[PDB]
Amino acid sequence: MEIDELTALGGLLHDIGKPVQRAGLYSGDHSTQGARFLRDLAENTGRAEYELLSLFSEFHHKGHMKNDELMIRRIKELSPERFGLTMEDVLNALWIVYEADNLASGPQASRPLYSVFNPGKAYPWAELDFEKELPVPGDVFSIRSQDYRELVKRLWEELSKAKLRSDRLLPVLEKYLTFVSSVTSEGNIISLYDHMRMTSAIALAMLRAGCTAEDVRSGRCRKEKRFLLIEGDFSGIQDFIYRVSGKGTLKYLRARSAYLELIGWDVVLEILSRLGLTRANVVFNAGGHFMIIAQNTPDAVKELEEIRAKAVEWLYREFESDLYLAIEWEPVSGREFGREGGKNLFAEARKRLKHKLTVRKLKRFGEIKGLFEHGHTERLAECPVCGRELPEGKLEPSASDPETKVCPTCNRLVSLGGNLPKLLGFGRTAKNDAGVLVEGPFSGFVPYLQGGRPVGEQILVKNTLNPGEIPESAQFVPYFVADYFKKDPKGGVATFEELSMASTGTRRLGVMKGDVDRLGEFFSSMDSPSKLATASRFMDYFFKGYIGAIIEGKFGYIIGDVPSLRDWPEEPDIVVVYAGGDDFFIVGAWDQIFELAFRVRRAFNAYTGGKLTLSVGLGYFDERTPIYRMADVVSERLDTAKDEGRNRVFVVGRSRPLDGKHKLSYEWNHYEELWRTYAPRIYAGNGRLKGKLESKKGLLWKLLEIRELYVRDPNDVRWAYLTAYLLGRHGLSDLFPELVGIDTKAVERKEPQPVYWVDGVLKIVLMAVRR
Amino acid sequence: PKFIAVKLIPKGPFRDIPRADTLFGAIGNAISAIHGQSAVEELVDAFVGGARISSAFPYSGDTYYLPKPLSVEPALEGILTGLDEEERYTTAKRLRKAKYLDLKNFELALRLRPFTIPEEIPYARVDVPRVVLDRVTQDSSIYFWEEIRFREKSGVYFLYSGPREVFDGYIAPAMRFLGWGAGLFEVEFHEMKIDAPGSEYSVTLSNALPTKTPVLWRLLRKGGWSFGRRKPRMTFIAEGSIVKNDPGGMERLELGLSHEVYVYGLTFPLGVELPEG
Amino acid sequence: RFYGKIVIKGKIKAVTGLHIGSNPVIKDPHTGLPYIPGSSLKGRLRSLFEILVNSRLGEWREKYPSLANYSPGSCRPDNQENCGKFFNRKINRGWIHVCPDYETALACPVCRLFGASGKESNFPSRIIVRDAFLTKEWEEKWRAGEAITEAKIEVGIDRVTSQANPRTNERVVAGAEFEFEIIYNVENTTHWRDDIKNLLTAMALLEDSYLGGSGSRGYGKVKFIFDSFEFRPLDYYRTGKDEDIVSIDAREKSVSDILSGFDSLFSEVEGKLE
Ligand SMILES: Nc1ncnc2c1ncn2[C@@H]1O[C@H](COP(=O)(O)OP(=O)(O)OP(=O)(O)O)[C@@H](O)[C@H]1O
């Protein structure tokens, strides 16, 4: 074990004593109890490096740095020359992790973790098992110490069999210490795992900085700019996943959605492994956006420039200008990781880096020596499937009716989709090995199926934290993907024609595209790397792990009465195309797309405690409609519902006048109110109208013809009259008390009339009982 | 700069907004139709070599929309300090939906002043599900082929910064030549004025093929069959970015036909003072 | 060359309404109005003309010499392109007439008046069918209401239970002029007389067959009352103060306009001819 393998673990286990201390195993502080917990573990796995990590557990309740001549006594009694270290080479890393814990942020035992969105509410202690019941921030309850004891016992069970490297201590602690409170104080929204992650990250950066205890004891490391915030944005994601003609099926779309995340993880892992950093040096990687806390040498900037030029050149050669990566770094100081002097130095440094990132994303593909040059080549033709759109005759017709020539990327991608149900993961190897399905900017990937054993020193394992049947040579890298999709009679991915046949009503395909609202302002308010890590990981766990729970039918105890077009089945007709970061894009049968929108919204309202909201566009298309129009409709609809109130759904494209008073969208507290109002009066369950409207089912069609008069002019008053002229002719006197009399309450404050809003409740019933 | 404008009153749908180079293709076929075979753009080489076309938006009334001075995207937060501390999200209206602006919000959308976005955009990018028919029997075949669709009083325009002799000799006869249905076209000339400050670095107003000089620019990729054989991709700067380190990016000769097609991309300036970069 | 752009401008009265669909509803772009899409006008105007020359291919056969290697039929029995029956072009289910080369389609009388494509052919359609857009009587009629569309309900009546079922249609109101226009390129001046006679023949196949959707039971019965035959020879574009042909307008019935006043209208355009 070298100094970095020691330091990245010592930054990872420096606060391991806090789950032991609140579980009652020894006495003292959280420092001596953690080292006493560790000191029997070195006699368990045989490796005497756990006894060395007890020294990194031996920091806090300080004044031991006045006892430093006794600290060399406690170091020499363990003989650190048994692994190729000296005394000062351990003592320097000890002071590095001490300094790094002060760079993670600026009582009663059983105090829980407070949620990062609404700081009042709190979680019970749970486990990151996405096939279980998942946490929602509830009222402030004392965490029972026996659950901490069970956590400590399961940690003893899962720390012996785990290897003593960072790649196994990261997901083992992430499975248990995610929702545990780091510091038991009010308003502490900082996870224990994220504090450990940022501590190990800043510790490994300061170790690779060159700062020793001569620099730490002086307090100079906070002022010397010894860090690097490296952010990277994937610009052009929407023009990469979705610019797909009608020949592209749902398998190929989901394959491109996996492929984009594979390219992103390849760049992140290359920056990790070419700097010397573990997976703890990534604050977040989600939605094509990633942030890395790294060291600051004159040569690390050169390594990053080599990586940036390499990845940008591979993207420009492969996918011409439809997927750009902006990788910009800002040299920050240790002073810029906290709240000093009242101002938010971390948010100001992140805003400076984001301004540099926007300057970069303007100058898109700024480093290509022959970008703007003439003399283009010969014999070029675009494939119909991709819009990769500049190969030569290299493109090869296969995996379909073999008369349409097809790019090799989408040759590999339908093959990826054919393994996509049975896929267990990928393996990041070199680009010229056996079984290499897709490439990357640096590395090819081997699809780890249900029986194989690939190795490329890194294994990207999907949606789990237990490595299991993968060898002890490679770096186990987990990654999360919202994966849910309706299997066909075979087991493979259903297409659009396979999905929209299960539409309770008209044969139309439902497409949903969302966003979390005002989230960029939400991450200019967290003033620590710990707070940013927790506030990004808890957000990303919703749109990558919780979605498969809400689609499968869980979380019913808080979702409740959404608009229910039908019974929510066992296996829905719902296929998640791309959910990650903040947004989520889900296609399927429209009768379940509709219910999924309100289920996602109300579970997310529960999940953030109401301090955040999500916008959702919806769309219904023919099953033969091209996917690029199917995304350019819902992107415009999400932008229109984004502009006109920022927290609103776009249920169905309605006609409106042009005065700026009629908004196309719907507040959720408006639409769920309306579906609680007008739907159970006129609509029964499961595709059949109400017994009063039975055999008079052309009545609701006449209301849209009435409403068109209000659409053509708002000032006239014919609509509320002809509504009663319709409803009197059929005896239904009571089904629309709002539509018959013009309400002065809306014309007081210049709000639209109550017949404007009801048609979005009408048409979704009218699509439900159409034949 | 007193550059004149040409307002094209439509009578119905267009296929697309003509992208500032497809007009110079269409001008080429127009002067290929009239004036014989050698008064075509070979003869108009040195005449567009000092005068530019540089298309832009519809108007929706008479408010001649103009795309974006793209040099407000870096320091947008340096512009909008006068607003309250909920100004972020208006920046997202002026970054993500930043498409087209009024002239009064364009003489001060550059020059570092707090512009305001418009919303009366004359777009109906509709999804017209056209033809399904066999000469004898049924045909199912819903092939979409969507098009653009306008407002009641709107219409495209574009600009002309050149001598009016060259305008009335080639382009102004051609702009009434242009008038399947989507070629609906009525031409009405005009003049226009833009305040346009000092010319260190400023907007191109066209689609642009630059001479290797990148400053803060959306990239584009423009195909085009152009009499049969498919033209290459020909990477372009989009509508309205800032390359003013002495531009003059020449038109590019192509291959495939008897006489060469050569693609536009040469730009004309404006006035911007950009913050930094 | 180009000596072209004949403007036939007119008004089409739907005597029993139209159903150019997209409940089935008419095409309604941006203001709520309906309109005939120029695609549908050109399409029906070629189906009628193509079936006319399908009947009449074996006897013309010297005029339009490229229409001789066909021997009428559809190539749906022998499922292949380029089969000499009349028409191949298998799109997704349909079989339309397109000559598969430019050299042939300089002479096929249907194909050289609505164009040809496929592989290495690229014939331009020589015609521009502008979408007709509800002339200013019925626009101002629409502003005070007047219900420009009309929901019309049919049924599938059975005979063993005599049950029925609503199949609504929502057609355009019977009687509405639409401001109909036709623009035509007049390349190859020797072709032109027979060409615009053929376009008028195809338009005269209308007023006696269905435009617009579910015809043959109503829903068609249109009438072209076209006013102004114009011309734009080569001086309307380089200039345009004066000097263009304007023909007689008022009560030109298309079944009488076709030749009984056409050569009295042709000979003025023979006066320019260049
Ligand atoms: N899971 C996540 N973790 C960290 N950052 C995220 C995550 N999801 C999104 N982001 C950040 O959000 C930024 C863009 O998000 P978005 O534009 O939706 O923010 P917003 O405040 O909602 O803006 P708008 O309301 O205009 O959409 C990106 O820079 C990305 O870094």
UniProtKB/Swiss-Prot annotation, chain A:
InterPro entries referenced in this protein's UniProt entry, alphabetically: Cas10-Cmr2_palm2, Cas10/Csm1, Cas10/Csm1_subtype-III-A, Csm1_B, GGDEF_dom, HD_domain, Rev_trsase/Diguanyl_cyclase
Domain HD: 1-106
Disulfide bridge map: none
Cofactor binding: number and manner: Ni(2+) and Mn(2+), but not Mg(2+), Ca(2+), Zn(2+), Co(2+), or Cu(2+), is required for ssDNase activity.
Keyword Hydrolase applies: yes
Classification via Pfam families: Cas10-Cmr2_palm2, Csm1_B, HD
Residue intervals of the GGDEF domain: 507-654
Additional note from the record: Encoded in a type III-A CRISPR locus.
Family: Belongs to the CRISPR-associated Cas10/Csm1 family.
Name this protein carries in UniProt: CRISPR system single-strand-specific deoxyribonuclease Cas10/Csm1 (subtype III-A)
Organism whose genome encodes this protein: Thermococcus onnurineus (strain NA1)
Gene name of this polypeptide: csm1
UniProtKB/Swiss-Prot annotation, chain B:
Key words of the record: Antiviral defense, RNA-binding
GO molecular function: RNA binding
TM spans (from-to): none
GO biological process: defense response to virus
Family membership noted in the UniProt record: Belongs to the CRISPR-associated Csm4 family.
Quaternary structure, from the entry: Probably part of the Csm effector complex, that includes Cas10, Csm2, Csm3, Csm4, Csm5 and mature crRNA. Interacts with Cas10 (csm1).
Protein function: CRISPR (clustered regularly interspaced short palindromic repeat) is an adaptive immune system that provides protection against mobile genetic elements (viruses, transposable elements and conjugative plasmids). CRISPR clusters contain spacers, sequences complementary to antecedent mobile elements, and target invading nucleic acids. CRISPR clusters are transcribed and processed into CRISPR RNA (crRNA). The subunit probably binds to the 5' handle of the crRNA, helping in discrimination between self- and non-self.
NCBIfam families: cas5_csm4
Further comment found in the protein's record: Encoded in a type III-A CRISPR locus.
Stated name of the protein: CRISPR system Cms protein Csm4
Organism: Thermococcus onnurineus (strain NA1)
Gene name as annotated: csm4
